[PDB]
Structure formats: structure tokens, C-alpha cells
Design a binder for this molecule. Structure first.
Ligand SMILES: C=C1C[C@@]23CC[C@H]4[C@@](C)(CCC[C@@]4(C)C(=O)O[C@@H]4O[C@H](CO)[C@@H](O)[C@H](O)[C@H]4O)[C@@H]2CC[C@]1(O[C@@H]1O[C@H](CO)[C@@H](O)[C@H](O)[C@H]1O)C3
Ligand SMILES: C=C1C[C@@]23CC[C@H]4[C@@](C)(CCC[C@@]4(C)C(=O)O[C@@H]4O[C@H](CO)[C@@H](O)[C@H](O)[C@H]4O)[C@@H]2CC[C@]1(O[C@@H]1O[C@H](CO)[C@@H](O)[C@H](O)[C@H]1O)C3
Ligand SMILES: O=c1ccn([C@@H]2O[C@H](COP(=O)(O)OP(=O)(O)O)[C@@H](O)[C@H]2O)c(=O)[nH]1
Length: 450
């Protein structure tokens, strides 16, 4: 292969997944692939015999700054600003080492990083290496991020202010103030990071968005205005599932059980790869699921319940005939199964986009960051689900599950989800927005060294 691309993901499930999907898409277009990855949260490299992995940044002896960080929960993500602040030298060494060891007939076309590795732009510039960015969150979120200075001066980022929570955001009517407070809160660390992420995204040679035009058409002018480099909208879950990059073992016994269910009769429930709840809320969710009277498959990741290894507070047999709890599944493959009628999601972008691409309507909860914005956009703009925007109460949970899955009143939501899937499929056909994005990305990358 004449042209190599180096990809560098952020080492969490929701960032590794789209990077490795992208890597596969690019591999199928004729590029050779090297993945730079931390030892921390590494995927199974034996699932990717066609990729070269190079492990960087936390090899032994480990950096004192990284070493003692926990491997789960809130503070595991501190690896991100820490690597941004201290990783440049190593990244440069690793890139050079690879460029120096390459064959005569092989060139490195570009580096593709997660947008959150904003430090990588200066490193790539210092080597005369083009950097492209993969955004793993939505165009709508980007629009909100660039609007932060307006939100700041309007008073929305003061958490002591608890007025106007249910009002539309001034100059940004698609959101309510409470959505902005949940997304950004007071967090200075987030403000700093988003600021740098945005600045170095604008300075990059191109931006790949895990999305499609017909999903976020209202947000496209903002991106074209804010980012001078080309943007490419490719909905990665339509090209392939992220099964190979799973960091946990799959419970595939779920498929035998799904095969015993009537069509569209199962609620799939999963709150993603990093979320956690109090014991009280875990129990309220379980009761809502039971009260709904619908069959459900609930992925509860070990560590999801604060206080318990897995699901010890749950009484033995509490889920009845109708419910099953597992640790981890191949989520997109589950969402593609005929038994699934709805998806109760935490509104992480990969999960939301996967559900959209499989035509599965949603119930939304959120745990902050981009999640409330994704929930709001999907529930109010696209209208492909119901947003549980006021906590966990069994009655509310039960009503929402029933509305999406069974009520005649929710038929429009189910239909909206079916049609949105079809638009995703059409976008991949010749002349479609996604097809043209991918063709242009390949031509653009191939032109970078010329
Ligand atoms: C870049 C990053 C730093 C980060 C550190 C931890 C930090 C906080 C979440 C901000 C608030 C305080 C604090 C402590 C928290 O509450 O926690 C911060 C911003 C966003 C965050 O990346 C997220 O990292 C997640 C993995 O932890 C990843 O799954 C998300 O997609 C990604 O957006 C995490
Ligand atoms: C560099 C490129 C990336 C690029 C990717 C598609 C993308 C967009 C047009 C930006 C907006 C979103 C989106 C998704 C878009 O609306 O896509 C359009 O969606 C329509 C359906 O709604 C389709 O009918 C159109 O055909 C489609 O363009 C973007 C910028 C400029 C662009 O040019 C290309 O540069 C290439 C060289 O790298 C060159 O080979 C092509 O001739 C040239 O078109 C194209
Ligand atoms: O049982 C599960 C639960 C989640 N996922 C995958 O984990 C990723 C979660 O990413 P998301 O952006 O939805 O949320 P995060 O985990 O980053 O909060 C998605 O690709 C899911 O398909 C999975 O494979 N199996």
C-alpha cells in the first residue's frame, strides 16, 4: 500500500469505537493503517490483524501524573488534559520514529486524531505532517461549544442562578437553559479544554464528523462558517459496527433470548461505558422497567451502581419473565435485531447514532456533557424519542417506555425513527451526502502530499 494513515484515539470506548470504524473505512479504500494508542483501555489488537498498533504515552516506567489515576469513573478522564499538557515530546518522537522506519515506496499521508487531542496539531505542524480531526460528538454540540462565550455573558454558566431553567436559551432556541447547565455546569476545566479543542480543530487540515447531513442539517452552516478546512460527514455505524473494538467481553447469549421475543417487543436499556448511578436511582429505574410491563434487556456495566460490584441491591427474581440483565453486549447488533422496539439510552453520541442508523426510537436520560444536547435535539428537533428530563420516577419511566413502544400516540416517533434510518441509508448511495463525503475525504487525503 502506497499511503499510510496514522490514527490516534482517546482511550475510552466512545472514542475508540469511531476511530477504529473510521480506520476500517479508510483501510477498505486502500490505505495502510497504524493506530497509536495508550496501554490504558487498549482494544484487542488480535481483532485487527490488518492494522499496526504502536503503544505510546504510558509505557513502563509510567509517568507519575498518569500512574495513580483510577481506571474508572469521573477521574479516569483526567488522562486527557494530562496527555494534552505533557505528551507532545513523546508523540513527536513516535511519529518521527515511524516516518524514519517507513519503506521507500510508502508515505504517511496524514495523522487523524480525536479532536480532544488538541496538543497533536503543533506536533504534526512541527513535522510538516497534516492533521485531520475526528469529531466523536455531534455538529449540534459543536455549535453549542462555539456559543459558550454568549452563554457565559448571558449568565447560563453560573450554577447558583436557578432561574429560567425551563426557558429557551436566548439566541439558541433549540435548547432550554437547564440543558446548558447540565452540559457545561460551572466546569472551568471543560471550558479550557473545549476552547483549545475548538482552536486546534479550526487549525487542522480537515474535520471528519461521525454524522450525516440529513441528521443535523440545521448545524451545517455553523461548521462551514467556523472551520476553514473541509468537513466530511460520514455516519460510521452505517459502514460497520464497533464490535471489534469492544473493551469488555460480549454476552452473546442475549441473541437466543431475543430470538424468543415477538417483533418490536423488547426495550433495550444501556447507559453506556462510563456512567454511574446511586443505589436509590438504580432501584427506581428497575421499578420503572417492571411497571412498564414491557420485555427488556438491560445492560448494567459492572460499576454502574455506586456501592456495588454489579447488581447486588436488586432482589433475586425482581425482573420476572420479561427482563434480563447482562454486563455487556454487541450493542449495534442488538439494536439491529427484530425484537428491539425501543432504546432507553443515556444519549451518548455513538449510542444515539447507532439507534438512528438501526431505526430504533429512543427514551433519553442523560449524565451531562454532550448527552442533554443530544437528547434535546433528538427528542425536539428530529422527534425520534422521548426525553426523561426531570430525573428518575417509576411512573414517568413507565409512561415513556409505553409511549414509545406501544401507545398509538407514539406511532409518529416510531415512524420518525424508521424514516431517519432510511435517510441514513439513502445518504450512502451514489450522490448521497455521506457517499460524497467519503469520496471527497479519500481524494483529499490522497492529495495532501502533492
Ligand atoms: C476531556 C475531558 C476531561 C474530563 C475529565 C474529568 C472531568 C470532566 C468531565 C469535566 C468535569 C469534572 C470531571 C472531573 C468529571 O466530572 O469527571 C472533563 C471534561 C470532558 C473529558 O472528556 C470526557 O471523558 C470521558 C471519559 O472520562 C469520555 O467518555 C467523554 O466522551 C469525554 O467527553 C473528561
Ligand atoms: C472537500 C469537500 C468535502 C465535501 C463533502 C460533502 C460535504 C461538503 C459539501 C460540506 C457540507 C456537507 C457535505 C456532506 C455536503 O453537503 O455534501 C453534498 O451533499 C449533497 C446531498 O445533500 C450531494 O448532492 C453533493 O454532491 C455533496 O457535495 C464538503 C465540502 C466541499 C467538498 O468538495 C469536494 O472536494 C473534493 C476534493 O476533496 C472533490 O473531489 C469534489 O468534487 C468536491 O465536491 C465536498
Ligand atoms: O453493552 C454495550 C454498551 C455500549 N456499547 C458501545 O459503547 C459505545 C458507547 O458510546 P457512547 O458515545 O454511546 O457513550 P459513552 O460510553 O462514551 O458515554 C457505543 O459504541 C456502544 O455501541 C457496547 O458495545 N455494548
Amino acid at each position: 500500500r502506497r499511503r499510510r494513515i496514522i490514527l490516534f484515539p482517546v482511550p475510552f470506548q466512545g472514542h475508540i469505537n469511531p476511530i477504529l470504524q473510521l480506520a476500517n473505512v479508510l483501510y477498505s479504500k486502500g490505505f495502510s493503517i497504524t493506530i497509536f494508542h495508550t496501554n490504558f483501555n487498549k482494544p484487542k489488537t488480535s481483532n485487527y490483524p490488518h492494522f499496526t498498533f504502536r503503544f505510546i504515552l504510558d509505557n513502563d516506567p509510567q509517568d507519575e501524573r498518569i500512574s495513580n489515576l483510577p481506571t474508572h469513573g469521573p477521574l479516569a478522564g483526567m488522562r486527557i488534559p494530562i496527555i494534552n499538557e505533557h505528551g507532545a515530546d513523546e508523540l513527536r518522537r513516535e511519529l518521527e520514529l515511524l516516518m524514519l522506519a517507513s519503506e521507500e515506496d510508502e508515505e504517511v499521508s496524514c495523522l487523524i486524531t480525536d479532536a480532544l487531542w488538541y496538543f497533536a496539531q503543533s506536533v504534526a505542524d512541527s513535522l510538516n505532517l497534516r492533521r485531520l480531526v475526528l469529531m466523536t460528538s455531534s455538529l449540534f454540540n459543536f455549535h453549542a461549544h462555539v456559543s459558550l462565550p454568549q452563554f457565559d455573558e448571558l449568565g447560563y454558566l453560573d450554577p447558583d442562578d436557578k432561574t429560567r431553567l425551563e426557558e429557551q436559551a436566548s439566541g439558541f432556541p433549540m435548547l432550554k437553559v437547564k440543558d446548558i447547565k447540565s452540559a457545561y455546569s460551572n466546569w472551568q476545566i471543560l471550558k479550557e479544554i473545549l476552547g483549545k479543542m475548538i482552536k486546534q480543530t479550526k487549525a487542522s487540515s480537515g474535520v471528519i464528523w461521525n454524522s450525516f447531513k440529513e441528521l443535523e442539517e440545521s448545524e451545517l452552516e455553523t461548521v462551514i462558517r467556523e472551520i476553514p478546512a473541509p468537513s466530511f460527514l460520514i455516519p460510521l455505524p452505517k459502514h460497520l459496527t464497533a464490535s471489534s473494538s469492544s473493551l469488555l467481553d460480549h454476552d452473546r447469549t442475549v441473541f437466543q433470548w431475543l430470538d424468543q421475543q415477538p417483533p418490536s417487543s423488547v426495550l433495550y436499556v444501556s447507559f453506556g461505558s462510563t456512567s454511574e448511578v446511586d443505589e436509590k436511582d438504580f432501584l427506581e429505574i428497575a421499578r420503572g422497567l417492571v411497571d412498564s410491563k414491557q420485555s427488556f434487556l438491560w445492560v448494567v456495566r459492572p460499576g454502574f451502581v455506586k456501592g456495588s460490584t454489579w447488581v447486588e441491591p436488586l432482589p433475586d427474581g425482581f425482573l420476572g419473565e420479561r427482563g434480563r440483565i447482562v454486563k455487556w453486549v454487541p450493542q449495534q447488533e442488538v439494536l439491529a435485531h427484530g425484537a428491539i422496539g425501543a432504546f432507553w439510552t443515556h444519549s451518548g453520541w455513538n449510542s444515539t447514532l447507532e439507534s438512528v442508523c438501526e431505526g430504533v426510537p429512543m427514551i433519553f436520560s442523560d449524565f451531562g456533557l454532550d448527552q442533554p444536547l443530544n437528547a434535546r435535539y433528538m427528542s425536539d428537533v428530529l422527534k425520534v424519542g422521548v426525553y426523561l428530563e426531570n430525573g428518575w420516577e417509576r411512573g414517568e419511566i413507565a409512561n415513556a417506555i409505553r409511549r414509545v413502544m406501544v401507545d398509538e400516540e407514539g406511532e409518529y416517533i416510531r415512524q420518525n425513527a424508521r424514516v431517519l434510518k432510511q435517510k441514513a441509508d439513502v445518504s450512502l448511495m451514489k450522490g448521497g451526502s455521506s457517499y460524497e463525503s467519503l469520496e471527497s475525504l479519500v481524494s483529499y487525503i490522497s492529495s495532501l502530499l502533492e
